[PDB]
PDB file of N, CA and C in Angstrom:
ATOM      1  N   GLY A   1       0.826  -1.221   0.000  1.00  0.00           N
ATOM      2  CA  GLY A   1       0.000   0.000   0.000  1.00  0.00           C
ATOM      3  C   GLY A   1       0.844   1.248   0.000  1.00  0.00           C
ATOM      4  N   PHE A   2       0.375   2.277  -0.673  1.00  0.00           N
ATOM      5  CA  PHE A   2       1.080   3.516  -0.752  1.00  0.00           C
ATOM      6  C   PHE A   2       0.096   4.658  -0.835  1.00  0.00           C
ATOM      7  N   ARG A   3       0.330   5.693  -0.061  1.00  0.00           N
ATOM      8  CA  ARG A   3      -0.478   6.863  -0.118  1.00  0.00           C
ATOM      9  C   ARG A   3       0.067   7.799  -1.184  1.00  0.00           C
ATOM     10  N   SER A   4      -0.550   7.764  -2.343  1.00  0.00           N
ATOM     11  CA  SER A   4      -0.134   8.586  -3.460  1.00  0.00           C
ATOM     12  C   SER A   4      -0.401  10.065  -3.169  1.00  0.00           C
ATOM     13  N   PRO A   5       0.646  10.910  -3.279  1.00  0.00           N
ATOM     14  CA  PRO A   5       0.553  12.356  -3.015  1.00  0.00           C
ATOM     15  C   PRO A   5      -0.190  13.122  -4.103  1.00  0.00           C
ATOM     16  N   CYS A   6      -1.284  12.589  -4.546  1.00  0.00           N
ATOM     17  CA  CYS A   6      -2.076  13.223  -5.567  1.00  0.00           C
ATOM     18  C   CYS A   6      -3.523  12.762  -5.448  1.00  0.00           C
ATOM     19  N   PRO A   7      -4.372  13.503  -4.705  1.00  0.00           N
ATOM     20  CA  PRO A   7      -3.984  14.744  -3.992  1.00  0.00           C
ATOM     21  C   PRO A   7      -3.077  14.471  -2.775  1.00  0.00           C
ATOM     22  N   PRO A   8      -2.505  15.529  -2.161  1.00  0.00           N
ATOM     23  CA  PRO A   8      -2.715  16.916  -2.570  1.00  0.00           C
ATOM     24  C   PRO A   8      -1.536  17.534  -3.310  1.00  0.00           C
ATOM     25  N   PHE A   9      -0.832  16.765  -4.123  1.00  0.00           N
ATOM     26  CA  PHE A   9       0.259  17.353  -4.868  1.00  0.00           C
ATOM     27  C   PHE A   9       0.176  17.021  -6.357  1.00  0.00           C
ATOM     28  N   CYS A  10      -0.701  17.722  -7.042  1.00  0.00           N
ATOM     29  CA  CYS A  10      -0.825  17.635  -8.493  1.00  0.00           C
ATOM     30  C   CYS A  10      -1.261  18.972  -9.072  1.00  0.00           C
TER      31      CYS A  10
END
């Protein structure tokens, strides 16, 4: 599992 930084970085 990975918390994709999109949001809040896109």
